[PDB]
Short mmCIF file of C-alpha atoms and ligand atoms in Angstrom, two decimals:
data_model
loop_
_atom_site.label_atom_id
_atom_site.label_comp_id
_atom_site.label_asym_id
_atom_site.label_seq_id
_atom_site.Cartn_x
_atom_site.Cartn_y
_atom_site.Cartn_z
CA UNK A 14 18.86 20.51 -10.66
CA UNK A 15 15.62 20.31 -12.86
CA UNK A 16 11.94 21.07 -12.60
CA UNK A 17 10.67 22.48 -8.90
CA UNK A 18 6.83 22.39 -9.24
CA UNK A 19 7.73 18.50 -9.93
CA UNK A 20 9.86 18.80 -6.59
CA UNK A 21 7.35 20.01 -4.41
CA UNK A 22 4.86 17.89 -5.41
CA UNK A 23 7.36 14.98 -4.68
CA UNK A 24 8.12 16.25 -1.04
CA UNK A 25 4.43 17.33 -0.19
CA UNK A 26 3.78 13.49 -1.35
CA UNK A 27 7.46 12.49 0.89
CA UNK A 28 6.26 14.24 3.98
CA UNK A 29 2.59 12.80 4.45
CA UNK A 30 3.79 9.45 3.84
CA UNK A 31 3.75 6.86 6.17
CA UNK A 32 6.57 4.53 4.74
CA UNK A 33 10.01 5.66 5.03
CA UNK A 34 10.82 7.44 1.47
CA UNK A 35 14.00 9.17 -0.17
CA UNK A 36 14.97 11.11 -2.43
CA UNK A 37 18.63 11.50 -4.62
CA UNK A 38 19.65 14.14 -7.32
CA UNK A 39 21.25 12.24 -10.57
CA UNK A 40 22.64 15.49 -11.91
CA UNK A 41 25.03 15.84 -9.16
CA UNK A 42 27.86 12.93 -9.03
CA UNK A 43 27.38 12.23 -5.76
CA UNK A 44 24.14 11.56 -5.91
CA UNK A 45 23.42 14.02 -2.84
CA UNK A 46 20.06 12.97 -0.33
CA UNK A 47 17.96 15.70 -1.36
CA UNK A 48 14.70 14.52 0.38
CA UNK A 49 14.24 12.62 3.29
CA UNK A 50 10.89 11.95 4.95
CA UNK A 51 10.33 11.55 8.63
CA UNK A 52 9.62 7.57 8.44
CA UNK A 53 12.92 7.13 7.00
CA UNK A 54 14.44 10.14 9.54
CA UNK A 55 12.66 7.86 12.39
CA UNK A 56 14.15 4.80 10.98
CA UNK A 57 17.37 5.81 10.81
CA UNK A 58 18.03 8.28 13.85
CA UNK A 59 18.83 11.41 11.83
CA UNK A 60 17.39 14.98 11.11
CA UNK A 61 16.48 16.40 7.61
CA UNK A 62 19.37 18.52 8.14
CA UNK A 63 22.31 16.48 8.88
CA UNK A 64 22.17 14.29 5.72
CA UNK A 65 20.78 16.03 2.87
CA UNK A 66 23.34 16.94 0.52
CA UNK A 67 25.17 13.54 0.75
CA UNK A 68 24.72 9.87 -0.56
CA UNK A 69 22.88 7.78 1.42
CA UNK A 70 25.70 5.06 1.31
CA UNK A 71 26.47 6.94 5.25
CA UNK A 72 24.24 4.14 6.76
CA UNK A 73 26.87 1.30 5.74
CA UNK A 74 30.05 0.66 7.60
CA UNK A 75 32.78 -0.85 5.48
CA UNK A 76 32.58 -3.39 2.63
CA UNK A 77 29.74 -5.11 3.09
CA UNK A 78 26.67 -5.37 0.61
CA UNK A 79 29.21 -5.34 -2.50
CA UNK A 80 26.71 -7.69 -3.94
CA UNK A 81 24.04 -5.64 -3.28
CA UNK A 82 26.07 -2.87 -3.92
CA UNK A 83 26.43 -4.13 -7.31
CA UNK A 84 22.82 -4.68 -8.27
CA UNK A 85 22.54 -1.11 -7.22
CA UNK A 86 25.06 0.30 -9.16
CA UNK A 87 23.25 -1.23 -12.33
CA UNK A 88 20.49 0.07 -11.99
CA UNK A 89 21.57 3.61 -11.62
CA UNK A 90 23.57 3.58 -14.64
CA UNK A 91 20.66 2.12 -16.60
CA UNK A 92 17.60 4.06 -14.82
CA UNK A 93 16.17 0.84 -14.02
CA UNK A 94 13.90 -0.32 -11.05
CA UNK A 95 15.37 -2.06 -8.41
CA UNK A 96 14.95 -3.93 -4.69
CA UNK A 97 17.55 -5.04 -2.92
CA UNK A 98 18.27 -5.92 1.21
CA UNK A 99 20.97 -3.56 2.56
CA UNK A 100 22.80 -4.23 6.12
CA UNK A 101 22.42 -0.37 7.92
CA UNK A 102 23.34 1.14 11.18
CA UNK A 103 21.34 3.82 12.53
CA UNK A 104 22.89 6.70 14.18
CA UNK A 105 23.10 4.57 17.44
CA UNK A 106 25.11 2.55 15.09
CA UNK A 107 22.45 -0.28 16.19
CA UNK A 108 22.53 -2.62 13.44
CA UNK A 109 18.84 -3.12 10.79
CA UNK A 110 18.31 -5.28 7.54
CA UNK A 111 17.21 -2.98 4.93
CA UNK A 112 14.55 -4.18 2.04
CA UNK A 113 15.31 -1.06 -0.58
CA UNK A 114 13.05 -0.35 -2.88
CA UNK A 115 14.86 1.84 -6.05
CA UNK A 116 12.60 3.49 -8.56
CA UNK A 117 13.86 5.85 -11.39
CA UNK A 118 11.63 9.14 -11.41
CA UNK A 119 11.22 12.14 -13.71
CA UNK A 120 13.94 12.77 -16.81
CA UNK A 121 14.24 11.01 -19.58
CA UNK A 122 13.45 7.03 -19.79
CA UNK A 123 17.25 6.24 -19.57
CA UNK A 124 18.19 8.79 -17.38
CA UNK A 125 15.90 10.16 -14.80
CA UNK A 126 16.62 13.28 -12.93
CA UNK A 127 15.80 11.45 -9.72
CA UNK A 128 16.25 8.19 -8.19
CA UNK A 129 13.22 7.26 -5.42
CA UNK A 130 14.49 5.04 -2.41
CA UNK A 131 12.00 3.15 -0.13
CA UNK A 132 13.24 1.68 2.88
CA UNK A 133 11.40 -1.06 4.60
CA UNK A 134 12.77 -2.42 7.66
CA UNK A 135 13.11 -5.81 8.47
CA UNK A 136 12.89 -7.87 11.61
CA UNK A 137 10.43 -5.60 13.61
CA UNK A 138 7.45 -7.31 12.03
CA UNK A 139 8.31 -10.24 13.94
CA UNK A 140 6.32 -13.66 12.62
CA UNK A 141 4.82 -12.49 9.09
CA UNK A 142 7.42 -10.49 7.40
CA UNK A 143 6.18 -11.63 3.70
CA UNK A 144 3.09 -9.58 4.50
CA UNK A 145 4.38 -7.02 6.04
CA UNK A 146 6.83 -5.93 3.10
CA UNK A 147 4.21 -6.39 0.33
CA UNK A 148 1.76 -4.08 2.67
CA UNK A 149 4.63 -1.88 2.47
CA UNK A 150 5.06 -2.19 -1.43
CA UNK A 151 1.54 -1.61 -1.31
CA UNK A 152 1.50 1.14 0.39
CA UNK A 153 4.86 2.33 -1.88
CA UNK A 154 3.06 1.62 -4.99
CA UNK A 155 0.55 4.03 -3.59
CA UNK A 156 2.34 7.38 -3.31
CA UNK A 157 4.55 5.97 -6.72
CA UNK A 158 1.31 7.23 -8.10
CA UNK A 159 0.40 10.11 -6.12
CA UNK A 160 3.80 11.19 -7.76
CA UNK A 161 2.97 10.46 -11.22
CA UNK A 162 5.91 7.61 -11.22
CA UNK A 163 3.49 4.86 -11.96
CA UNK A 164 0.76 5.42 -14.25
CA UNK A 165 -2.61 5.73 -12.71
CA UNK A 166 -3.35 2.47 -15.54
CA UNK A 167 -1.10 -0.12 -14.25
CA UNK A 168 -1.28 0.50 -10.27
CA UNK A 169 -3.27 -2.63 -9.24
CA UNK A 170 -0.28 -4.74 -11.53
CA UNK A 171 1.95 -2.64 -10.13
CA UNK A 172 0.91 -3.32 -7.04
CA UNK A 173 1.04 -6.85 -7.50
CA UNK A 174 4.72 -6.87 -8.85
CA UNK A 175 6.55 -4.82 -6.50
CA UNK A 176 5.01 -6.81 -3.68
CA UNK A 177 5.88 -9.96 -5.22
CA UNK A 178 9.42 -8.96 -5.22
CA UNK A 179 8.83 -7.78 -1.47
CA UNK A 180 8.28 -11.43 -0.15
CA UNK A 181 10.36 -13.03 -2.42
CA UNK A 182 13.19 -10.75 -1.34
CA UNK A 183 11.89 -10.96 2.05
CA UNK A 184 12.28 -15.02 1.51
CA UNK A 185 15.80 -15.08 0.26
CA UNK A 186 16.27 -12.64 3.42
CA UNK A 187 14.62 -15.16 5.81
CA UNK A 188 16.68 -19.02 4.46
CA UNK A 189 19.68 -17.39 5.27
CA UNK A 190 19.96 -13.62 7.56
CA UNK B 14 -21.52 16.86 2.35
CA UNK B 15 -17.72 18.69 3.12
CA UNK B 16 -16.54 15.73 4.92
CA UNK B 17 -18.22 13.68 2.23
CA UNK B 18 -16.42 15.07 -0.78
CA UNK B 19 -13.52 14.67 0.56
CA UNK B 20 -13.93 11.51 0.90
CA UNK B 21 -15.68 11.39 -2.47
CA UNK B 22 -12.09 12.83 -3.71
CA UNK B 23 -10.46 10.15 -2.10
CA UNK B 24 -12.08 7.48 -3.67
CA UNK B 25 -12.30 8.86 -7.05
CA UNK B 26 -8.47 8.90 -7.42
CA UNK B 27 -7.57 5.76 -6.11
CA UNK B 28 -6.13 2.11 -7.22
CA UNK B 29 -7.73 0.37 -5.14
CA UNK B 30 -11.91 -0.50 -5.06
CA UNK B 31 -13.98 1.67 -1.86
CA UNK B 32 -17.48 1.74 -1.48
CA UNK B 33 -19.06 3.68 0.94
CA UNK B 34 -22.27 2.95 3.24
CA UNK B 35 -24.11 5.11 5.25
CA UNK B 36 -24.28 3.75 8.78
CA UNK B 37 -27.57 6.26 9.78
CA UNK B 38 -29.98 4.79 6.84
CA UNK B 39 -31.37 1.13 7.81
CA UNK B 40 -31.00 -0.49 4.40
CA UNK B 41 -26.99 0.13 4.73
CA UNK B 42 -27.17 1.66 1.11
CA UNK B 43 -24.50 2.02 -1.11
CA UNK B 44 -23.64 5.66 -0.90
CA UNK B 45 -20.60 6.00 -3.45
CA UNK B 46 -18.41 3.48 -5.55
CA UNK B 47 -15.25 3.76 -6.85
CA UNK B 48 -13.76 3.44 -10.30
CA UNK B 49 -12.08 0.19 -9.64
CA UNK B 50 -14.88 -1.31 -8.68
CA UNK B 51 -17.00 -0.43 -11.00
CA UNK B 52 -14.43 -2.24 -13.46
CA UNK B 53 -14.19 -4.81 -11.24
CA UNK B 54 -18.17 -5.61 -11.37
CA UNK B 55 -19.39 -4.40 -14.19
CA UNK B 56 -21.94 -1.56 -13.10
CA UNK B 57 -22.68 1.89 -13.58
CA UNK B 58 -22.38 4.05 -10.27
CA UNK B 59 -25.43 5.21 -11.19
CA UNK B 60 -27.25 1.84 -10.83
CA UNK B 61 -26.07 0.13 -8.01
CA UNK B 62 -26.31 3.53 -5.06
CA UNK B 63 -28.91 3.45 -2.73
CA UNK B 64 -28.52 -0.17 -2.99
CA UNK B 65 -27.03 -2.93 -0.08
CA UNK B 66 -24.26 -4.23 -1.39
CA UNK B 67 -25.59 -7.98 -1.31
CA UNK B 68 -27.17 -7.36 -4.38
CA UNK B 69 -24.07 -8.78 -5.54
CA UNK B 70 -24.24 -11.86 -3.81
CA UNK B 71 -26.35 -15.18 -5.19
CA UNK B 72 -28.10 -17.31 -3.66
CA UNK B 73 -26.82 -18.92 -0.07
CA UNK B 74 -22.99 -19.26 -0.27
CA UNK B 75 -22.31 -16.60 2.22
CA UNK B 76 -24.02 -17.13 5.69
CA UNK B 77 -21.05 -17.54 8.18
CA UNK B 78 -19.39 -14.11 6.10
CA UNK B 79 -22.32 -12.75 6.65
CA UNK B 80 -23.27 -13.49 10.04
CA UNK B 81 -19.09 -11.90 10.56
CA UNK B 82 -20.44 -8.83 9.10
CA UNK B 83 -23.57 -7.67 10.67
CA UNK B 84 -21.40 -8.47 13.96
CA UNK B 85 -18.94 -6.38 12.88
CA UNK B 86 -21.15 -3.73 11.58
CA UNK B 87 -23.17 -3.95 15.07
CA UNK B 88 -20.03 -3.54 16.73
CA UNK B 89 -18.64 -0.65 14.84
CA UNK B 90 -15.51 -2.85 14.08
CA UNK B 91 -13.10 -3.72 11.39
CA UNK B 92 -12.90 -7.13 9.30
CA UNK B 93 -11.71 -8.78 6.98
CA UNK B 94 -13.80 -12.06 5.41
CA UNK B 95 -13.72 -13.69 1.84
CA UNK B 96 -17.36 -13.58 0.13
CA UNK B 97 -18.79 -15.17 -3.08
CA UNK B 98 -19.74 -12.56 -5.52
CA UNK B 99 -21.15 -12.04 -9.14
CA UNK B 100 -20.76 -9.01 -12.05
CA UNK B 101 -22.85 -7.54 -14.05
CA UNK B 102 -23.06 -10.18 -16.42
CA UNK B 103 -23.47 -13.30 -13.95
CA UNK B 104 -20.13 -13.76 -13.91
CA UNK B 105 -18.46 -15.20 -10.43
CA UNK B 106 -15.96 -14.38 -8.15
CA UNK B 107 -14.24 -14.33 -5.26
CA UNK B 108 -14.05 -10.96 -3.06
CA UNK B 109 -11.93 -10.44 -0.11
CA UNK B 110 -14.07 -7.59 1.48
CA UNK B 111 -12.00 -5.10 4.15
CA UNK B 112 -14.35 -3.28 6.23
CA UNK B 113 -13.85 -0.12 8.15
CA UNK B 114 -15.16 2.21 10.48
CA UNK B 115 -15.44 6.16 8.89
CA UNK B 116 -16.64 8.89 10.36
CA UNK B 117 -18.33 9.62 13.94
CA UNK B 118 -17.30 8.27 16.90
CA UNK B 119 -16.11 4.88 18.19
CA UNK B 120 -19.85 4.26 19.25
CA UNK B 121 -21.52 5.21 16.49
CA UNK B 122 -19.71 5.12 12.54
CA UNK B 123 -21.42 7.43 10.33
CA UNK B 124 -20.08 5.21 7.00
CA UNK B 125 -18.83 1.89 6.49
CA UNK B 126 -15.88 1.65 3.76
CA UNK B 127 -15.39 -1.52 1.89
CA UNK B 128 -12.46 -2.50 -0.35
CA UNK B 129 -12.78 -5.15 -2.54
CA UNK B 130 -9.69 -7.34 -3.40
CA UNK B 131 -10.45 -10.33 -6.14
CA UNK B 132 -9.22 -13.40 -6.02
CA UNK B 133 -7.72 -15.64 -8.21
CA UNK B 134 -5.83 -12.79 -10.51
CA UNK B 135 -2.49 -12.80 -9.15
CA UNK B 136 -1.58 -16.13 -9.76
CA UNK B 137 0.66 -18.03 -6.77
CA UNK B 138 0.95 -14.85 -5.31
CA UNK B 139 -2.65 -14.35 -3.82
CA UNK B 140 -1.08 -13.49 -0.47
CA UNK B 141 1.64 -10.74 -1.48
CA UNK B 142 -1.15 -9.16 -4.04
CA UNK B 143 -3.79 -9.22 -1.50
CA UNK B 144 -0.86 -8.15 1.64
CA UNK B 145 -0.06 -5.54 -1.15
CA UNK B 146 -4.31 -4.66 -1.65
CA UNK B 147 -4.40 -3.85 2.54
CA UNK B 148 -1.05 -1.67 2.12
CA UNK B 149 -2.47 0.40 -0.30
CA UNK B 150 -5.56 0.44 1.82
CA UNK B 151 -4.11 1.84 4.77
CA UNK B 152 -2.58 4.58 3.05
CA UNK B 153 -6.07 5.70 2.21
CA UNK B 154 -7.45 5.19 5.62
CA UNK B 155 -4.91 7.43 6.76
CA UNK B 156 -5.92 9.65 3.60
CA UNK B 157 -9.33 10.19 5.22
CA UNK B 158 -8.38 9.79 9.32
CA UNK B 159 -9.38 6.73 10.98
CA UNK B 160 -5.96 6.04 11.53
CA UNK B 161 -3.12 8.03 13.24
CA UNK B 162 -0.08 9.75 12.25
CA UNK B 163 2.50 7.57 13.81
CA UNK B 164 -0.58 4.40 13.26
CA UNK B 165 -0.68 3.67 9.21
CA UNK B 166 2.66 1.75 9.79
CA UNK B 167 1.37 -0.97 11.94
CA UNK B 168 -2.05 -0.71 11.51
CA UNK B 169 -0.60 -1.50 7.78
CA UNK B 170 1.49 -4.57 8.53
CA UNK B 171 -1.65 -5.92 10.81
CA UNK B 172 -3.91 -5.50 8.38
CA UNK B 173 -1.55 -6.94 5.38
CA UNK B 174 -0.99 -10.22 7.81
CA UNK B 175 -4.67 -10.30 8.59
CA UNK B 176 -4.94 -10.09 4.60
CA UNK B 177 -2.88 -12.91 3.75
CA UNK B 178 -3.59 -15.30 6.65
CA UNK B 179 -7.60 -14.82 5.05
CA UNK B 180 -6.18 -15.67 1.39
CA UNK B 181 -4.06 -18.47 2.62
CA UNK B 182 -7.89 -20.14 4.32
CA UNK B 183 -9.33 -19.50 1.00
CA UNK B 184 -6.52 -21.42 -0.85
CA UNK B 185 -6.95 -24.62 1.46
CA UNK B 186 -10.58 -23.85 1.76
CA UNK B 187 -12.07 -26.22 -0.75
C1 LIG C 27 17.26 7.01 -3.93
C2 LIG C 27 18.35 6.20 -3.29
C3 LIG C 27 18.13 5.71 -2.01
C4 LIG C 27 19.09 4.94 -1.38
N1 LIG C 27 18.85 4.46 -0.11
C5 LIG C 27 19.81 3.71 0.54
C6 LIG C 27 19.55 3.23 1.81
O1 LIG C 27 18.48 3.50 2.37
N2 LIG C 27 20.50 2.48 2.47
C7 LIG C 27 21.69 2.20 1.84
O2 LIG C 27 22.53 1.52 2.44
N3 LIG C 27 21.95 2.66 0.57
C8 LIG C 27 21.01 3.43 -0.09
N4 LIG C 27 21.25 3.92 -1.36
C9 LIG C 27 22.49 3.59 -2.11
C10 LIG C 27 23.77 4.33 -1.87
O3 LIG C 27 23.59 5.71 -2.08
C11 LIG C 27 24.67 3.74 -2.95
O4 LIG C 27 24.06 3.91 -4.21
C12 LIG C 27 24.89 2.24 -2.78
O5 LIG C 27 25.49 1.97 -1.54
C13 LIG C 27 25.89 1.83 -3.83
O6 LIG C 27 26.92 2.77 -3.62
P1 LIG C 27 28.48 2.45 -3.73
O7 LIG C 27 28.77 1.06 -4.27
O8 LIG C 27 29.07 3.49 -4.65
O9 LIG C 27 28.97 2.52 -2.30
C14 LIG C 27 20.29 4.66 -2.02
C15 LIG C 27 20.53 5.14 -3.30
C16 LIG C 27 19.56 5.92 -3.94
C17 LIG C 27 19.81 6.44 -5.34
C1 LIG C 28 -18.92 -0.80 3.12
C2 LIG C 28 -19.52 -2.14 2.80
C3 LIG C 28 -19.11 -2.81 1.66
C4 LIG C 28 -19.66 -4.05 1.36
N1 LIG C 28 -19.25 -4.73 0.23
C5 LIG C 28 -19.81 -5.96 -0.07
C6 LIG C 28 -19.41 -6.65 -1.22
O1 LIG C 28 -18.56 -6.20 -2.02
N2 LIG C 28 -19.96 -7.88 -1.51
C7 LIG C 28 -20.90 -8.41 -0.67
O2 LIG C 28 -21.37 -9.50 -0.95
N3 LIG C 28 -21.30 -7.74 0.47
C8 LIG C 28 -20.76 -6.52 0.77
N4 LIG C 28 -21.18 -5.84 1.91
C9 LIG C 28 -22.17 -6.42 2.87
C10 LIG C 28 -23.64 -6.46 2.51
O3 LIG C 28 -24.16 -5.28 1.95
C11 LIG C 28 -24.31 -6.60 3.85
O4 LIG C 28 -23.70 -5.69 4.75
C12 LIG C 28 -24.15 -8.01 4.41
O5 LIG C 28 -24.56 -8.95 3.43
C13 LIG C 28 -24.96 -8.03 5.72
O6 LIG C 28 -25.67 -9.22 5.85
P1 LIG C 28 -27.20 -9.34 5.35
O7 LIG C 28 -27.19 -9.38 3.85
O8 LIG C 28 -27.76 -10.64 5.85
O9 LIG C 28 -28.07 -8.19 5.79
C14 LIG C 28 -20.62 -4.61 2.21
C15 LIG C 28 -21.03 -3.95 3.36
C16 LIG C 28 -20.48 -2.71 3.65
C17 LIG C 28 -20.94 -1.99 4.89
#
């Protein structure tokens, strides 16, 4: 638990957001949900209150995305930037491919209080899913900002770089499911 | 003026290039600019308003844009087209102009806004920088209200496939 005028600011940006946006507490070992817009509560199925105070790993079922899994737990350790697909189940257990966008915000370079999550869903954009993520990193990129996560300086490479990943992940996602 | 500085506040704090035209005056005249785009060509804001944004054009290389334009401004509709453009300093480039509807009614816009995204910065990845430009876009579309609450997600993914299919022409256009 750190800073709170930092925390509001984060979920009055969460809250008028229109991509799906999370956020997790790296002081507790869990690493507890402790913001959850309503994109992502949409998304997934769930209310605010049913999920905050636990790690988001809930919308898995079993062993799979070790891989991914992997790349994930990297980056934590390291406070490093991330994005990643993720198999999920909503709460109807109803199954979606999840492009997972990890940034590191607030502490210390190394070790941020906070980890960001940004889920983009895949498969519902039906023809041009390249576009569709990067409009979403775009968009992501966007309230990064608004947060003070990326600096105000580097947003239009920014920009460019996380949706570069987007396709390219998206890509990878498409020659092979 | 109120609904105009907020607007105004909009613009000021944003990554991506907006201009602003007032739909009621007949010369279309740039009515505010943006940071961005003010890097992006060169100017001051101070002298390019009350100016129509062709001033940045040349010459005759835009006709079929332009003719998509004053339909779409006519029309009170949104588009997307790629225009050649020139700085400050004569220097060209190209500009994949977003227009929108702002303000009013469906029948009658009181502004215009207009996001520039250049071309020809991002490498092989023109389509996922520009897709990434209309993301942004629509956030601040949404940031002003011309687009709904449960709207700026696929009003968003249009617009970002809309974006790319124009930068993938442009690549294969000459
Ligand atoms: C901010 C943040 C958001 C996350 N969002 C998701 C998510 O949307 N879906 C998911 O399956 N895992 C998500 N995770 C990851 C899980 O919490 C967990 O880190 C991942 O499954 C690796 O955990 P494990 O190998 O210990 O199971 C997120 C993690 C963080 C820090
Ligand atoms: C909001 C807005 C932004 C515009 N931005 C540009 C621009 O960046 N470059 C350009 O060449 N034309 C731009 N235009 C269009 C020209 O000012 C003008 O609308 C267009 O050239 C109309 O055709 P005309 O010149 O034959 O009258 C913009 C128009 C609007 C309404």
């Amino acid at each position: 638990a750190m800073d709170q005028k930092q925390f509001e600011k984060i979920r009055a940006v969460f809250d008028r957001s229109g991509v799906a946006l999370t956020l997790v507490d790296m002081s507790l070992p869990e690493q507890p949900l402790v913001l959850a817009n309503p994109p992502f509560l949409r998304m997934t199925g769930y209310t605010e209150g049913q999920i905050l105070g636990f790690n988001c790993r809930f919308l898995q079922r079993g062993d799979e995305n070790a891989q991914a899994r992997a790349d994930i737990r990297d980056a934590l350790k390291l406070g490093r930037e991330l994005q990643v697909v993720l198999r999920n189940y909503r709460a109807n257990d109803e199954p979606f491919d999840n492009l997972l966008f990890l940034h590191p915000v607030g502490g210390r370079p190394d070790a941020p209080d906070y980890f960001l999550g940004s889920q983009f869903e895949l498969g519902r954009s039906g023809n041009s899913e390249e576009a569709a993520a990067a409009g979403h990193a775009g968009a992501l990129t966007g309230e990064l900002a608004r947060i003070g996560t990326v600096a105000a300086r580097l947003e239009m490479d920014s920009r460019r770089h996380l949706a570069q990943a987007a396709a390219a992940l998206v890509r990878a996602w498409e020659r092979r499911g």
